[PDB]
């Protein structure tokens, strides 16, 4: 589904409180980055406050529960395993040997649902593309899909 079930909201409520250091109803930068460090990442507060601000409904820069449900919905629907990402990466890569070229990426993301033109594909790539090679790799892909 796109919308959450009473079981998932329940648990996104149990997670919400668990994360909260003060015990209020707002998550800060500091609170969530501590979980993000334990789940294996390492953003800074700054890199946190960025993605906080985008997803803020009210605007305030602290995370309320309907914006955690909006966050974690958008997470939990998309990501399965991480293994799902990998196999879907090497579904997208036509030959399969490494990289999804601009060409390959256009065609399969156009078959998926939004129609992309050349420059729409280039632009998706370019912001994430470290080599400047015009291809999207697995770490660039995982970075790219995270962003827009
Ligand atoms: Ca708090
Ligand atoms: Ca807010
Ligand atoms: Ca390829
Ligand atoms: Ca690249």
From Swiss-Prot:
GO terms for cellular component: calcium channel complex; calyx of Held; catalytic complex; centrosome; cytoplasm; cytosol; extracellular region; myelin sheath. GO terms for biological process: autophagosome membrane docking; calcineurin-mediated signaling; cellular response to interferon-beta; cellular response to type II interferon; detection of calcium ion; G protein-coupled receptor signaling pathway; G2/M transition of mitotic cell cycle; long-term synaptic potentiation. There is a cross-link at residue 21 (Glycyl lysine isopeptide (Lys-Gly) (interchain with G-Cter in ubiquitin)). It is found in: Cytoplasm, Cytoskeleton, Spindle; Cytoplasm, Cytoskeleton, Spindle pole; Cytoplasm, Cytoskeleton, Microtubule organizing center, Centrosome; Cell projection, Cilium, Flagellum. Changing residue 129 to G: In LQT14; reduction in calcium affinity; not changed protein abundance; not changed structure; significantly decreased thermal stability in presence of calcium; significantly decreased RYR2 interaction; increased ryanodine-sensitive calcium-release channel activity; decreased of KCNN2 calcium-activated potassium channel activity; not changed KCNN2 expression; not changed KCNN2 location at membrane. This protein has four functional calcium-binding sites. This is Calmodulin-1. It comes from Homo sapiens (Human).
């Amino acid at each position: 589904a796109d919308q959450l079930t009473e079981e998932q909201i329940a648990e996104f409520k149990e997670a919400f409180s668990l994360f909260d250091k003060d015990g209020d109803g707002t998550i800060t930068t500091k609170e969530l980055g501590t979980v993000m460090r334990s789940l294996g990442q390492n953003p800074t507060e700054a890199e946190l406050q960025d993605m906080i601000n985008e997803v803020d409904a009210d605007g305030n820069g602290t995370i309320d529960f309907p914006e955690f449900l909006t966050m974690m919905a958008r997470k939990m629907k998309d990501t399965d395993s991480e293994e799902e990402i990998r196999e879907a990466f090497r579904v997208f890569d036509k030959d399969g040997n490494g990289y999804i070229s601009a060409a390959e990426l256009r065609h399969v993301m156009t078959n998926l649902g939004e129609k992309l033109t050349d420059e729409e594909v280039d632009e998706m790539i370019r912001e994430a593309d470290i080599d400047g090679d015009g291809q999207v790799n697995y770490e660039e892909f995982v970075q790219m899909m995270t962003a827009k």
